[PDB]
Amino acid sequence: MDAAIRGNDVIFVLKTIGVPSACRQNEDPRFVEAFKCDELERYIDNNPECTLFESLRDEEAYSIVRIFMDVDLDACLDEIDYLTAIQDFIIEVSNCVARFAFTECGAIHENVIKSMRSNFSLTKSTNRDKTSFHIIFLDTYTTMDTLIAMKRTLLELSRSSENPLTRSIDTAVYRRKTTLRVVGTRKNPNCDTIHVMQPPHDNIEDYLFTYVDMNNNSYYFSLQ
Ligand SMILES: [Mg+2]
Ligand SMILES: [Mg+2]
């Protein structure tokens, strides 16, 4: 933990793709709402058609986030290839982030490796025609500007890798005002596929990239 780094338990969600700036700013409940996690879980239960997108509420004021990736393989994998690819993916992505943190962020390389590999949540999209998931490194924190600075590094990783999952990292998600679709909710009123939670993580806070509650196991770094 660190005095200079405070947490966040207020989750800001957009209720559709492409919300105006004016509607985010005025927080029109038709388009956006801030929730505690228990409120968010209840809202999802009570709104079975919802399409929810987590976003930083005021990233000029506060932009601490968990490292996350949106993996977009528009192809099907054999089950065993997928399991092997996930494990190799974790190694490749953690090595890549740890090197960037070490050289660009004054970070402790082994703490990035350990925090990333030891605890992460995985979703699985129900679309069986592809291999889509979101990953949250629950205990590895940074700033959104650091993720933006790391965008080309991840792009180059996705180009050099032989791993089909690493190759499918969607680096366009690292940008200002970005969104991550909330697990269990739909993308749009016309597509009914969802991401489901995966063991061993079954609480919604484990699937949110703006939920920040560090403990001494947590590790934080940012651009130096
Ligand atoms: Mg995706
Ligand atoms: Mg994507």
Residue numbers in the entry: 1 to 224
What does the paper say about this structure?
MPXV E5 is encoded by the E5R gene, the mature protein is 785 amino acids (aa) in length. MPXV E5 can be divided into 6 domains: the AEP domain, the ZnD domain (Zinc-binding domain), the D5N domain (a domain associated with D5-type helicases), the Linker, the SF3 Helicase domain, and the C-Tail. MPXV E5 belongs to the SF3 helicase superfamily, which normally forms hexamer and unwinds DNA with 3′- to 5′ polarity.
No crystal grew for AEP-ZnD, but one high-resolution AEP structure was determined (1.65 Å). No DNA template or RNA product was observed, but clear electron densities confirmed that two Mg2+ ions (common factor of DNA and RNA polymerase) and one pyrophosphate group (PPi) were captured in the AEP structure. Since no PPi was included in the crystallization sample, the observed PPi should be produced by the AEP-catalyzed de novo synthesis reaction. In addition to the side chains of Asp70, Asp72 and Asp170, the A-site Mg2+ ion also coordinates with three water molecules. The B-site Mg2+ ion coordinates with the side chains of Asp70 and Asp72, two water molecules, and two oxygen atoms of PPi. Besides coordination with Mg2+ ion, the conformation of PPi was further stabilized by H-bond interactions with the side chains of Lys130, Ser132, His134, Arg181, Lys187, and His197. PPi in the MPXV E5 structure well mimics the β- and γ-phosphate groups of the incoming site (E-site) dATP in the MsCAPP structure. The similar structural arrangements suggested that the AEP domain of MPXV E5 follows the conserved two-cation-assisted, in-line attacking mechanism in catalysis, in which A-site cation activates the initiating site (I-site) NTP (or dNTP) by removing the proton from the 3′-OH group and B-site cation facilitates the reaction by increasing the electrophilicity of the phosphorus center. The de novo primer synthesis activity can be implicated by the PPi molecule observed in the crystal structure of the AEP domain of MPXV E5.
